[PDB]
Design a binder for this molecule. Structure first.
Ligand SMILES: NC(=O)C[C@H]([NH3+])C(=O)NS(=O)(=O)OC[C@H]1O[C@@H](n2cnc3c(N)ncnc32)[C@H](O)[C@@H]1O
Ligand SMILES: NC(=O)C[C@H]([NH3+])C(=O)NS(=O)(=O)OC[C@H]1O[C@@H](n2cnc3c(N)ncnc32)[C@H](O)[C@@H]1O
Ligand SMILES: [Mg+2]
Ligand SMILES: [Mg+2]
Lengths: 438, 438
């Protein structure tokens, strides 16, 4: 029967068929050494002369990289093998030979070349591990919220309303000269969903007109955006903590093989899986940065009332063994929808969660304004056209309740967990400022 | 403790708190009749004088529609109640009153008005049932493929490559005058994924520049697009059947309450849940249409070699108690990527699956060309720029294998299962030709 390498362990001492590709080959003496990939793993295959037809054995000398194979043999247990098993080959059929030289040969390549050949690179072990961890998180997100009786609620991609500032917005031409924007966040719609279904979350693509090539920016990425009716600022942070803890615990438990392949230390992720996340006010945070900055001139200082930069977040996150919250920022550097702190009219009830080891923001959230008139002032204070947000105001006119929510950047979470050098490695086909292909 | 109506059954004869909204109210005699919504269901609440403060009882006279409430009471079993239970009210707190009249009052409204107020309409029972069935399918898709060891693989949204014809493509302006297209299908990338991970599927938004307002067209919708290495035309149809069967079985088993609310007969969906889907060649299909057309002048005839229309599909699907396959269409009315039938050079190895009761196409799929030179001819035969598809050609140069896949339109599947009159009712915030708001 045809099996998958993923489950070769439960086919020990049995006749099996594999369908896959030739990853590597060495031919010396009276034995061929093969590594086969099938898409679910990598397995050692040995072709010994006598045990195979001479028509086969001569063919196994002229097999280039990424040759398509069908392979028949018996599975044997062996400690000195990638996985602890091997295939003793008995017969072999070639489905196709490479039409040219395989571009990603046994040489070191620069990231630029690798990303130019991303459609081929995805075959290799490191992307293999990443994509499987991405899959694990995507499944695990659905289970988490399903068990909590949350409803998935797909926010529209085409939108008239801006969410996070007029500065960076893509435009789409429609019919008869009409235009619309590409969603930067589906939050506004998630709120409507919240007042309708109590517990909702979006899980769709989002688009920012970013103009940098930093290790944490893409033009296209995926955002998970929960929203809950009646939920406070405090409850929001607790939920975020519950989520991140579960995700990391799930990766540690089920994807330990993949972590190994990425050379990531599990002991550096266990703390994040166990909750008890530290917590700072913005003020305490700015003060801790200014301490670090005075001891290290590479870390820049931060004047109070100014917005955090990546090095600020980076330095701050290295002080903790797990993600740290930063809360109660000044209203003037935040968003129009954010609820004022009842104690201090300068602050809003928001939070960002920073990933450890220098990674920075993985989540941004807040409590929302529920008072109609307060919202109206905020709109035009931010200089936003009131007309466009009239459906958003309806949510305050009818059935208005306190409510909170956040948005988790999936790529950034993937980069952190896998320990990658850039978010572009965390998605199949990245879209950056200067990278629109393939 | 605060509970949800969704699970009121396991709180019988207990003190509970509800947080929700007033759906309907009638006040006569010495008793108030309430229906409360909380987002997870609808429950009957009774406020009897004496059992409540007089400050509360007088207030329960001036409670408009969609008032925000907190409510304390004991749960009592009662056969004559929506769900089989009620809340005996003891105390009540109002969180907010409507700022104006609630637009969707106890009158009949046209669909145009309802869709203009979609952000409010989502609160009502029929959308409630739809969105919960949509949620059920979205979770169930992930379980199906996860258990089969398939990998979720997110295809890019921004793309240079067209998939289903140059005719209908949106354009996005980027940086420095550059432009890209909105994905109409992520298939091309799913193929790269297939050669890398063997068993993959996308589950993202897709965009067609459709210019009609028919009951099955949107500009924005969600497509599930599996792709498998080594899989034939025959195996493809079997997999599609396996998928649709599971989805419908899952809805029938877990969402029977929601079906009731939509007035959908379960007996009309059971057949689709049990496999054994009928099958036609294109030729046999055209011939059966021409029979129907000759008996009914409302059903139009179909000349052989011409592409099916919605009435053709509609009439055809009514002849079966479950979804029917139509396979082996003429190459000239199909796509560039489709593999030629080895027996007949006029035909390609494709299939469409039609949903019963007049619904029509829910799936479109095929086997793919794996021969490099054959693909090159097809490209420029269709008049497509070879340069743009050079990464697609690489998949034929290196590790090229036979492979097949399909794409399932989620909205159309939702419309069918729920028995809706239009696909716009099957997504939270639809985007049609003349409907871009809210
Ligand atoms: N529903 C909500 O409350 C979300 C909220 N409206 C919002 O969009 N805030 S956020 O932009 O800071 O958060 C977006 C998150 O998404 C990530 N993000 C934000 N921008 C990017 C870019 N350019 N590339 C990759 N990832 C990005 C980052 O992890 C952020 O935490
Ligand atoms: N990966 C693949 O093999 C998919 C393939 N490249 C494809 O796009 N073919 S399809 O357009 O016929 O199928 C798209 C499906 O998606 C649905 N569809 C297709 N177009 C629409 C519109 N405009 N609105 C709503 N739904 C639509 C319909 O159910 C189709 O079966
Ligand atoms: Mg932010
Ligand atoms: Mg089609």
């Amino acid at each position: 029967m045809r099996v998958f390498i993923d489950e070769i362990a439960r086919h020990v001492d049995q006749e099996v068929e594999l369908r896959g590709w030739l990853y590597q080959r060495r031919s010396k003496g009276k034995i061929h050494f093969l590594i086969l990939r099938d898409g679910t793993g990598f397995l050692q295959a040995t072709v010994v002369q006598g045990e195979v037809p001479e028509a086969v054995f001569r063919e196994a000398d002229h097999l280039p990289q990424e040759t398509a194979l069908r392979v028949w043999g018996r599975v044997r247990e062996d400690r000195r093998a990638p996985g602890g098993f091997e295939l003793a080959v008995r017969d072999l059929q070639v489905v196709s030979r490479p039409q040219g030289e395989y571009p990603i040969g046994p040489k070191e390549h620069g990231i630029d070349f690798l990303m130019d050949h991303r459609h081929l690179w995805l075959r290799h072990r490191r992307p293999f591990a990443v994509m499987r961890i991405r899959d694990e998180l995507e499944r695990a997100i659905h289970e988490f919220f399903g068990e909590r009786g949350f409803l998935r609620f797909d926010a529209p991609i085409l939108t008239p309303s801006a969410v996070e500032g007029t500065t960076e917005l893509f435009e789409v031409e429609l019919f008869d000269g009409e235009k619309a924007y590409l969603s930067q966040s589906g939050q506004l719609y998630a709120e409507a969903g919240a007042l309708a279904f109590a517990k909702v979350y979006t899980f769709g693509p989002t688009f920012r007109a970013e103009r940098s090539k930093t290790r944490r920016h893409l033009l296209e990425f995926w955002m998970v955006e929960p929203e809950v009716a009646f939920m406070t600022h405090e409850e929001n942070m607790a939920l975020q903590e519950e989520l991140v803890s579960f995700l990391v615990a799930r990766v540690l438990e089920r994807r330990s093989r993949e972590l190994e392949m990425l050379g990531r230390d599990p002991k550096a992720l266990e703390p994040a899986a166990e909750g008890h996340y530290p917590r700072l006010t913005y003020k305490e945070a700015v003060a801790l940065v200014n301490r670090i900055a005075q001891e290290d001139p590479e870390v820049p200082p931060l004047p109070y009332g100014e917005d955090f930069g990546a090095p600020h977040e980076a330095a701050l996150s290295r002080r903790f063994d797990r993600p740290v919250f930063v809360e109660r920022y000044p209203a003037r550097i935040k968003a129009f929808y954010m609820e004022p702190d009842p104690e201090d009219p300068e602050l809003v009830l928001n939070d960002d969660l920073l990933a450890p080891e220098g990674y920075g923001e993985i989540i941004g959230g807040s409590q929302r304004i529920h008072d109609l008139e307060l919202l109206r002032r905020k709109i035009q204070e931010f200089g936003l056209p009131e007309e466009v947000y009239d459906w958003y105001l309806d949510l305050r006119r009818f059935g208005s309740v306190p409510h909170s929510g956040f948005g988790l950047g999936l790529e950034r979470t993937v980069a952190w967990i896998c320990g990658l050098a850039h978010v572009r490695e965390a998605i199949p086909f990245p879209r950056m400022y200067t990278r629109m292909r393939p």
